[PDB]
Design a protein around this ligand. Structure first.
Ligand SMILES: Nc1ncnc2c1ncn2[C@@H]1O[C@H](COP(=O)(O)OP(=O)(O)OP(=O)(O)O)[C@@H](O)[C@H]1O
Ligand SMILES: Nc1ncnc2c1ncn2[C@@H]1O[C@H](COP(=O)(O)OP(=O)(O)O)[C@@H](O)[C@H]1O
Ligand SMILES: Nc1ncnc2c1ncn2[C@@H]1O[C@H](COP(=O)(O)OP(=O)(O)O)[C@@H](O)[C@H]1O
Lengths: 400, 823, 50, 55, 193, 403
């Protein structure tokens, strides 16, 4: 019922300075000029009509036969000449549309019009604005790019190679005749995880993306947890071949629990179905399933096997240079200070992750905006260290 | 509401001080203001307290006796006006003020002072040049402050606002000049022509001063001033800078004619002539193992007819272009052309020349046998093959001129057409006086047909592209006048304005004279010719007036059918500002709304502009929109959409796009008109095995090569109305891609000019930090050996600080020398 | 995310804080001229504004 | 008896900043490169033949 | 009036909730007995005269528009689990002055002016937690910044029992105002639930 | 220490750029124009069919307007319940109607059958169009599967299992001897069970070796669903589709939820499962024995319900394998090495010995890994890439055992 959405927005995010300057001003003027020239162009073209040809052949033949009164109903089934449509209050009509019949856009299970009286379908509501049962493609192909993350060059190269085996050089293993949908098993500390997301946006620069986080321990009798993702991955194959990011459910939803029977039926259903979809001998498609977790120990032996789920990748803690890069990225938007206090905040620091870096950068601006408002606050040289402590790292009685 | 206890106490203290300063007797006026100003210029290195005292402070400053008291009073009003500004009261007080050292009053004040100076400098009338010098002196005092406190880019903003980039040269040191010049280059793309030239000239001035000639040549090529290119080539003297200049001229394709008095002149003219272009390109192709001739059959994936066979031959030549290694047209080539039917033998031989392009020695010997062929079409195709072979690459003896001796003016139309097109491709950008003096008389021939005359104009236009050749224009106008208007405006006079546009490419301004002389022409062709020459001349300028004039004229009903010039307006929409990503992705959306609600002729020409925006760049949104509009009811719209997808994916080997075209081939298998050109689009996508890109923007994708855009625009002008012309006869116009076909890999030499195996890191290069004019940041280091395909969005960078390139721009050819710290 | 922004906590009102809450709540009401509201709040052990 | 009709269907051009910036540049180049018969004489002083529809 | 009675013998006008106003003089409308009924637009009101999310009067059979009635959906279902802006000014709030000094900074500043936050670079204040003992800690300063910011007073306990859906209407559509504080009470969802 | 009101505005105007307010006004106009042009759309009509149907297919819409008085028999459609000896039809209608009608003169009573949807003309509710819907939901399109599964070398031939099932599946489909020499009908069923592994691959091989009456892969986990009666209807249409498709075999897979466990918690825990059990037995009881249709049920553990003792009369011949020995493993290597660009010059017998009882799935996995290592090395050759083949297979066997 959903194929694509009109992407006529996000007008050139590449504002090079991102800060108030003359170069950014000129780019905005060119942007704003180009908007009016288009509004010019379409307005000039729509009213300076090429020709006045009767009632555009619309009101003469079809608009009258469509009629004034109409009712909206779903279209059920298609036959060679007529159409089997299930209108409101459970009414079903076998009538051949021949006015405003866009056979491509009618489709089964879509809203169509009924001209009342002699009830004949005369049109279709292509928008219909209601495909709301299971929505996971709403966040498809996120705009985040490689540049948003830095200092993770080894992992970026590894994930890119694993995901550019398809798309790029598909004939490589096509001649090798494997077509492997191995996916990637991602490790990492619990202080990270949306980096497992941010490193995934590198592949999300191509095609779409789907996310299944938390889900459930599929208590549902039908199960279908990993199985509707299989349908959604099939829908992804219908679209540009998307990836399925199942972080934190490859660990909990697929747990290497020692228990065999009486284990909430997830071990019976979820793990088996995950292997069935991760096996290339059952389902085709360029869909790559990115399995990201913070507990490598709970890897199920079916998930452990590289024979079906290959391309194991470990995410380590950022190094000194990586900490410098991530702080530079996060503080680039904020213009921390003119003294550039960069290394003093990370030289001694250890076990600091991406989420912590974002938090301390956000709290640094908040504390300056509290009462130290000085544009580029001269206190930020040490207040950045003041809010990098911020306690809140770990706290548990004494026990020591 | 309750402030801090100390804050309130200091507020009351300042309230007492201003009341003391506001008292009647002036004997205490001086001590009060001495006390006050010290804490006024305290927080900048306070201002909140004196918020409601605007009127009282103005009265005090005006009442102050002239002298020290008045100019401190004007000082305090100025530093406080940055908050209490209903106007530039800060500068009017400061002009009355001391004019002593201002930089100690805080960074916020000096930055606001800098901007207000820029506002006044723009605001002051022409007759007012009294206060201009004090502002200029104030500017020359704040620029060193901006240089020290990393504020050079806004210093460039104010100096360019006051048009003082000449003293920007004298003030900037090399330690930060690289980012200032990069900031200048970014502003170049959007500033209009007179200041655009001004920033280009000052950019040359900075780089000439700092001995940064390789990037200066890049800027000189942007300025398209061959005289300045020669001047700066003479200015640089070192052997390393001399040889990198010749690569840059050779890579650009324009031959620089000089004397042998320079050192190592034989190598400089050879590398400028691209003699070793073919040898290096084949050598790298062999090193990638990409040399096997890819059959057109397995490109088609035939696991599941004369014109269709012709399309198969053309795409085979496209794939094996610049290679010269294809036995399909070499061993049994004579059998293939004999089996071929009607008009296609000329194109098949020209396709063979496409295989042998840039292969002068190899191509000429393997085409000599076909030169003496029996059929006139084969002979003409062989002559066109010779021109394709010598196209782009320059030769010392120039074999094309002697080879095309009787055929340049030969009575037979087909034989003359092949030679004329061959000479045009050969001498494209040569600007040779001998070639012009031999082809322009052929333009003056009356026995030649209308299309033959158009091809002569095309050849003259591409030879004299961007030269303002007066005699060429006079002959073009004279030929148009002599030809009758009724037979002019039928279907083939559309090449004469194209030659005019090429000859005045990138010049502008002077086009008023050409259109005034062309005003005598009748409306159906004049309205098309004047628009085409205007947009071609103003291409790559961001002149969004010229597009909106196009938008206004293409909006008219125009319904004998003069509305054909609506199409060239659409092509001009993309052509004016195809330079940077901005002005191309949004005019793209303009094309979307053109298709979304527009004329049949409009929607016929829109995919042509879509291809012109992003040729050889497979943008996902473009590919989707073109694919969705490839099934439109209008056959010509489908044809343009099919060709647009081929061009945007040309020289990319894009796997998913190739799959889409294969699906389109299955969709259009019933109708051969779409089928054979879907095959054509696939061959364009796999042209040259993707080794040579077709985007006319080179040198880090920001330089317009006149010859390549000339050949590209000729194809698009032909593709304005292929529904008539490709079906009829124009199987030869597709061979204009030779100018736009340039390799996109890195060839590394050394100081002794030998191929280096030095590895470089290649990956996406997009801006991360915009705090200043920082160089574009690369991510995704997939380093390997130096032959690497450089596509849009991604660049290259040296793996280590061990080999120093002649220029930081890493594309085409580059020489890497051993670093003094290399170890 | 959605909670890492702040984790502001509510301290139970002190004897002087309770005093103020009586004043806010007793400003609308009429009562005798003399009352030791501060001691009234302090007599309450802990408690809250409710 | 006369419509004085015009089917323009025309609208102006919306051009704002870099248009107008080089329109300013075109402005830089473009700088150098019935009363006596209607007051008194209303047609009421005519003569008419003896067939004349007059109230 | 007799003719009005005769017109009303055909139900007179039919009440319809206008949703979508198409360009070709078409409005979908929703009627309580049945629902959506696509119809033309009356002559007295143009295409642009149709205002979505309002009420309209229809005709008996053709259901042609009669008059754009004032709001009826809002008065009927105004109070389901939410509230519009109360006053509850911060003057009534006392004893927690050292705490509201943080709430004003973290909530009032982004809603009043996000431009400074965008210029600051960090412009993502999204959630505040507000834990404390029962009693003092029920719902206040959730009704004070409500008037100081004019957002909402949407108060949901969280102890309602499916948890899916429900909140979706309040998250986008049933806001009834772009400013929204959506104050949630005690988080009944225990750790790991 | 809040000190915000008034102060925040002053410091917001304290710094900025010289034209930061200008770009703000510029970008607000950018957003204003963006909303205006999103409102100023192109095709501003939700209803589509603008001209390709509205120019020529419209001309025939005039014909359907001339025939607008007919083709109005649509009204409403509902199932039928039963009938009398012949003329009268007692029918339950989706309008809850106790509906009977004289069937329309154009419709004979033979065509209309109990439980079939028929439209009724509102004037007289005559039986006008008895629509045979045969509508399949998307999940049912997954229960039905491809017919041409393509034959292989007995898909890693385990001679025991295949040769035991050929006389019970392949032989009845050949029908050479079932009628006379052996008792009436072939063995009543096949239970091709076994641990996760070779299960159902031999079924696919038998499907390819047999006629076009090819299997459909249904899953018991799919069959068990929410509410009551949906699983019963799904099994019914499962039999209907298999019966229509040339009486193809019905392949039940993962029978541990349709039959459930051996127990029900309180006869209310899994009772829809029991509803499906009753109807499935009614469907695959056979009634009159018929050598046309075949049924195979495959699970990993014999967790079938009480019908496990009735099935000796209905579903017999329980067989299993999933225990590849050296000869089985190396033959699975050979058939898998038939794919890819590999050749059997590799000493793949060494790796077959290295992995004891590595199924056929892991062998396919190991072969997939070998191809992945070849492309990782960027060499598309794998015929002579045997040492690299052995290296990647042994290291991944190490990873599978312990990673
Ligand atoms: N004997 C075999 N020869 C070759 N490949 C086999 C063999 N047994 C299993 N396989 C492989 O195992 C994978 C799945 O096997 P199969 O289809 O038999 O099982 P399934 O339907 O996935 O379920 P289960 O493993 O529970 O029986 C396929 O990739 C198949 O090639
Ligand atoms: N190295 C990095 N460079 C830039 N941004 C990062 C980096 N690491 C994390 N981030 C950003 O910070 C956010 C939190 O990262 P992460 O640690 O993955 O979250 P969590 O710890 O909650 O799983 C992510 O959305 C990501 O965009
Ligand atoms: N039920 C009530 N009626 C009137 N005032 C109250 C009530 N509950 C608390 N207050 C007062 O108002 C203030 C509310 O703060 P608090 O209870 O922390 O807000 P919230 O309930 O939203 O967490 C406290 O100082 C308290 O003295």
């Amino acid at each position: 019922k959903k194929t694509k959405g009109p992407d006529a927005a996000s007008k050139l995010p590449l504002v090079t300075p991102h800060t108030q300057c003359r170069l950014k001003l000129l780019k905005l003027e060119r942007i704003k000029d180009y908007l009016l020239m288009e509004e010019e162009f379409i307005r000039n073209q729509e009213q300076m009509k090429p020709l006045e040809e009767k009632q555009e052949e619309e009101r003469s033949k079809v608009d009258d036969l469509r009629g004034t009164p109409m009712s909206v109903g779903t279209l059920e089934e298609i036959i060679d000449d007529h159409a089997i449509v299930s209108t409101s209050v459970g009414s079903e009509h076998y009538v051949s549309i021949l006015s405003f019949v866009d056979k491509d856009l009618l489709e089964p299970g879509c809203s169509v019009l009924l001209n009342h009286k002699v009830h004949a379908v005369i049109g279709v509501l292509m928008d219909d604005t209601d495909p709301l049962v299971t929505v996971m493609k709403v966040e498809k192909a996120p705009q985040e790019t490689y540049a948003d993350i830095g200092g993770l060059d080894n992992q970026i190269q590894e994930i890119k190679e694993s995901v550019e085996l398809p798309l790029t050089h598909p004939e490589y293993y096509e001649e090798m005749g494997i077509k492997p949908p191995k996916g990637v098993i991602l490790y990492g500390p619990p202080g990270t995880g949306k980096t497992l997301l941010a490193k995934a946006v590198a592949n999300q620069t191509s095609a779409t993306f789907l996310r299944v986080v938390g889900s459930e321990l599929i208590q549902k009798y039908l199960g279908d947890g990993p199985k509707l993702v299989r349908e959604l991955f099939r829908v992804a194959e219908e679209h540009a071949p998307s990836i399925v990011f199942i972080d934190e459910i490859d660990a909990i939803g697929t747990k290497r629990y020692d228990s065999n029977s009486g284990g909430e039926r997830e071990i019976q259903r979820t793990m088996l179905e995950l292997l069935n979809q991760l096996d290339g001998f059952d389902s085709r498609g360029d869909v790559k399933v990115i399995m990201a977790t913070n507990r490598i120990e709970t890897l199920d032996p079916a998930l452990i096997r590289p024979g079906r789920i290959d391309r194991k990748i470990e995410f380590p803690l950022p190094d000194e240079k990586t900490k410098k890069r991530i702080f530079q990225i996060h503080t680039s938007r904020m213009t921390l200070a003119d003294d550039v206090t960069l290394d003093d905040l990370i030289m001694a620091k250890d076990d600091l992750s991406g989420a912590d870096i974002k938090a301390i950068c956000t709290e640094a601006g908040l504390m300056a905006l509290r009462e130290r408002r000085m544009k580029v606050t001269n206190e930020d040289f040490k207040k950045s260290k003041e809010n990098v402590l911020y306690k809140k790292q770990e706290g548990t009685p004494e026990g020591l | 509401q309750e402030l801090s206890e100390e804050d309130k106490q200091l507020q009351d203290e300042l309230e007492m001080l201003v009341e003391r300063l506001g008292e009647k007797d002036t004997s205490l006026y001086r001590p009060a203001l001495e006390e006050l100003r010290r804490q006024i210029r305290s927080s900048t290195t306070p201002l909140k307290f004196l918020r409601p005292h605007y009127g009282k402070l103005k009265e005090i400053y005006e009442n102050m006796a002239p002298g020290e008291n008045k100019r401190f009073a004007a000082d305090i009003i100025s530093v406080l006006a940055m908050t209490m500004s209903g106007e530039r009261e800060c500068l009017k007080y400061r002009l009355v003020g001391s004019q002593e050292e201002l930089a100690s009053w805080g960074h916020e004040y000096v930055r606001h002072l800098a901007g207000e100076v820029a506002k006044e400098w723009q605001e002051l009338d022409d007759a007012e040049k009294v206060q201009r010098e004090p502002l200029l002196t104030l500017v020359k005092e704040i620029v060193p402050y901006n240089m020290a406190h990393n504020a050079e880019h806004e210093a460039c903003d104010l100096l360019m606002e006051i048009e003082q980039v000449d003293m920007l040269e004298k003030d900037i040191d090399e330690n930060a000049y690289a980012k200032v010049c990069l900031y200048l280059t970014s502003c170049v793309n959007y500033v209009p022509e007179p200041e655009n030239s001004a920033l280009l000239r000052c950019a040359l001035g900075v780089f000439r001063k700092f001995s940064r000639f390789p990037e200066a040549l890049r800027l000189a090529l942007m300025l398209n001033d061959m005289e300045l290119v020669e001047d700066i080539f003479t200015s640089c003297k070192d052997v390393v800078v001399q040889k990198q200049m010749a690569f840059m001229l050779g890579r650009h394709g324009v031959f620089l004619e000089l004397s042998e008095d320079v050192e190592e002149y034989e190598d400089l003219t050879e590398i400028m002539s691209n003699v070793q272009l073919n040898s290096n390109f084949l050598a790298l192709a062999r090193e990638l193992d990409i040399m096997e001739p890819k059959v057109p059959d397995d490109i088609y994936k035939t696991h599941l007819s004369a014109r269709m066979n012709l399309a198969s031959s053309f795409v085979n030549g496209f794939v094996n272009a610049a290679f010269g290694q294809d036995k399909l047209l070499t061993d049994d080539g004579n059998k293939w052309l004999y089996k071929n039917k009607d008009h296609g033998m000329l194109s098949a031989a020209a396709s063979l020349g496409m295989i042998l392009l840039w292969d002068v020695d190899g191509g000429l010997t393997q085409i000599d046998k076909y030169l003496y062929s029996s059929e006139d079409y084969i002979k003409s195709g062989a002559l066109l093959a010779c021109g394709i072979v010598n196209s782009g690459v320059r030769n010392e003896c120039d074999p094309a001129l002697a080879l095309l001796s009787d055929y340049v003016l030969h009575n037979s139309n087909t034989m003359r057409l092949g030679s004329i097109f061959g000479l045009g491709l050969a001498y494209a950008g040569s600007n040779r006086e001998d070639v012009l003096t031999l082809l322009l008389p052929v333009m003056g021939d009356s026995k030649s047909s209308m299309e033959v005359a158009g091809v002569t104009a095309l050849a003259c236009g591409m030879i004299a592209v961007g030269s303002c050749n007066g005699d060429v224009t006079s002959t073009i106008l004279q030929t148009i006048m002599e030809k009758s208007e009724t037979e002019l405006k039928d279907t083939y006079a559309r090449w004469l304005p194209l030659g005019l546009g090429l000859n005045h490419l990138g010049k502008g301004e002077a086009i008023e004279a050409i259109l005034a002389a062309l005003e005598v022409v009748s409306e159906p062709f004049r309205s098309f010719a004047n628009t085409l020459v205007d947009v071609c001349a103003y291409a790559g300028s961001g002149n969004v007036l010229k597009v909106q004039q196009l938008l206004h004229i293409c909006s008219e009903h125009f319904d004998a059918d003069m509305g054909a010039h609506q199409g060239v307006a659409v092509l001009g929409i993309a052509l004016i500002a195809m330079g940077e990503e901005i002005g191309a992705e949004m005019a793209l959306r303009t094309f979307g709304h053109l298709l979304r609600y527009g004329e049949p002729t409009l929607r016929r020409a829109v995919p042509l502009a879509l291809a012109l925006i992003s040729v050889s760049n497979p943008r996902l949104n473009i590919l989707d929109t073109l694919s969705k509009f490839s099934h439109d009811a209008d056959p010509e719209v489908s044809y343009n959409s099919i060709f647009a997808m081929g061009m945007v994916g040309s020289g990319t080997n894009n796997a998913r796009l190739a799959a889409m075209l294969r699906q389109l081939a299955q969709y259009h298998a019933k109708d051969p008109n779409n089928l054979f050109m879907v095959r054509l689009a696939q061959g364009l996508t796999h042209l040259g095995k993707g080794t040579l890109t077709l985007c006319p923007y080179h040198s880090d994708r920001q330089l317009m090569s006149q010859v390549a855009v000339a050949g590209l625009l000729t194809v698009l002008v032909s593709f304005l109305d292929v529904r008539n012309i490709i079906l009829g006869k124009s199987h030869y116009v597709l061979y204009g891609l030779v100018a736009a076909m340039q390799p996109r890999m890195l060839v590394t030499f050394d100081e002794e000019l030998r191929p280096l195996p030095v590895s470089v890191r290649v990956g996406q290069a997009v801006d991360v930090v915009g705090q200043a004019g920082k160089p574009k940041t690369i991510t995704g280091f997939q380093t390997h050996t130096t032959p690497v395909l450089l596509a849009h969005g991604e660049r290259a960078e040296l793996a280590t600080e061990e080999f120093l390139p002649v220029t930081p721009i890493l594309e085409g050819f580059v020489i890497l020398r051993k670093n003094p710290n290399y170890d | 995310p959605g909670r890492i922004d702040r984790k502001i906590e509510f301290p139970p009102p002190n004897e002087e804080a309770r005093l103020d809450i009586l004043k806010i709540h007793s400003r609308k009401m009429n009562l005798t001229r003399g009352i030791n509201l501060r001691k009234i709040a302090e007599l309450m052990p802990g408690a809250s504004g409710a | 008896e006369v419509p004085k009709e015009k089917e323009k269907e025309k609208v102006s051009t919306a051009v704002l900043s870099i248009t107008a910036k080089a329109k300013k540049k075109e402005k830089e180049k473009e700088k150098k490169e019935e009363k006596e018969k209607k007051k008194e004489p209303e047609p009421n002083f005519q003569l008419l033949d003896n067939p004349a529809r007059v109230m | 009036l007799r003719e009005e009675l005769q017109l009303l013998q055909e139900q007179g006008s039919y009440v319809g909730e206008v949703v979508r106003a198409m360009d070709k003089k078409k409005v979908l409308v929703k009627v309580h007995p049945e629902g959506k009924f696509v119809v033309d637009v009356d002559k007295n009101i143009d295409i642009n005269d149709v205002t979505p999310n309002c009420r309209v009067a229809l005709r008996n059979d053709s259901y042609t528009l009669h008059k754009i009635l004032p709001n009826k959906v809002d008065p009927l279902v105004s109070l389901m689990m939410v509230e519009k802006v109360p006053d509850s000014t911060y003057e009534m709030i006392g004893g927690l002055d050292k705490q509201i000094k943080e709430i004003k900074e973290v909530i009032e500043l982004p809603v009043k002016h996000p431009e400074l936050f965008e210029a600051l670079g960090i412009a993502q204040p999204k959630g505040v937690l507000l834990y404390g003992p029962p009693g003092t800690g029920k719902t206040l300063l959730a009704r004070a910044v409500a008037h100081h910011t004019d957002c909402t007073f949407i108060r949901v306990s969280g102890s309602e029992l499916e948890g899916a859906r429900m909140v979706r209407e309040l998250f986008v559509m049933a806001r009834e105002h772009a400013p929204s504080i959506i104050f949630m009470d005690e988080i009944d969802s225990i750790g790991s639930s | 220490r809040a000190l915000d009101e008034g102060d925040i505005a002053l410091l917001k105007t304290y710094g900025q750029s010289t034209y930061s307010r200008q770009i703000k006004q510029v970008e607000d106009d950018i957003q204003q124009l963006l909303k205006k042009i999103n409102e100023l759309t192109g095709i501003k009509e939700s209803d589509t069919g603008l001209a390709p149907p509205a120019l020529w297919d419209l001309a025939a819409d005039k014909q359907t307007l001339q025939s607008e008085q007919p083709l109005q028999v649509a009204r409403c459609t509902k199932i039928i319940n039963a009938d009398s000896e012949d003329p009268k039809y007692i029918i339950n209608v989706k309008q809850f109607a106790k509906f009977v009608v004289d069937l329309s003169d154009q419709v004979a009573p033979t065509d209309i059958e109990e439980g079939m949807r028929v439209g009724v003309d509102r004037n007289k509710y005559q039986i006008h169009i008895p629509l045979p819907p045969k509508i399949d939901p998307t999940v049912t399109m997954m229960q039905v599967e491809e017919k041409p599964d393509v034959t292989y070398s007995d898909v890693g031939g385990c001679k025991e299992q295949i040769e035991k099932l050929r006389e019970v599946v392949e032989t009845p489909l050949l029908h050479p001897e079932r009628f006379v020499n052996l008792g009436i009908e072939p063995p009543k069923g096949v239970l091709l069970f076994g641990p996760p592994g070779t299960g159902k691959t031999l079924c696919a091989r038998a499907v390819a070796n047999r006629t076009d009456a090819c299997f459909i892969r249904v899953i018991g986990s799919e069959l068990v669903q929410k509410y009551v009666g949906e699983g019963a209807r799904m099994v019914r249409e499962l039999f209907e589709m298999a019966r229509t498709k040339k009486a193809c075999l019905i392949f039940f897979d993962e029978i541990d939820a349709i039959g459930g466990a051996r127990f029900d918690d309180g006869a209310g825990g899994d009772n829809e499962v029991q509803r499906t059990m009753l109807e499935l037995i009614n469907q695959l009881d056979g009634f009159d024995p018929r050598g046309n249709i075949k049924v195979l049920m495959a699970t990993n553990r014999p967790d079938t319900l009480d019908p496990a003792l009735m099935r000796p009369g209905r579903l017999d011949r329980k067989i299993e394998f999933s225990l590849p020995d050296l000869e089985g493993r190396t033959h699975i290597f050979k058939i898998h090495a038939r794919s890819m660009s590999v050749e059997r010059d590799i000493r793949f017998e060494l790796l077959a010995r290295l992995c004891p009882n590595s199924t056929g799935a892991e062998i396919r996995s190991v072969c997939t890994e070998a191809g992945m290592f070849a492309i990782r090395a960027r060499r598309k050759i794998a015929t002579e890439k045997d040492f690299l083949e052995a290296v990647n297979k042994v290291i991944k066997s190490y990873a599978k055992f312990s990673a």
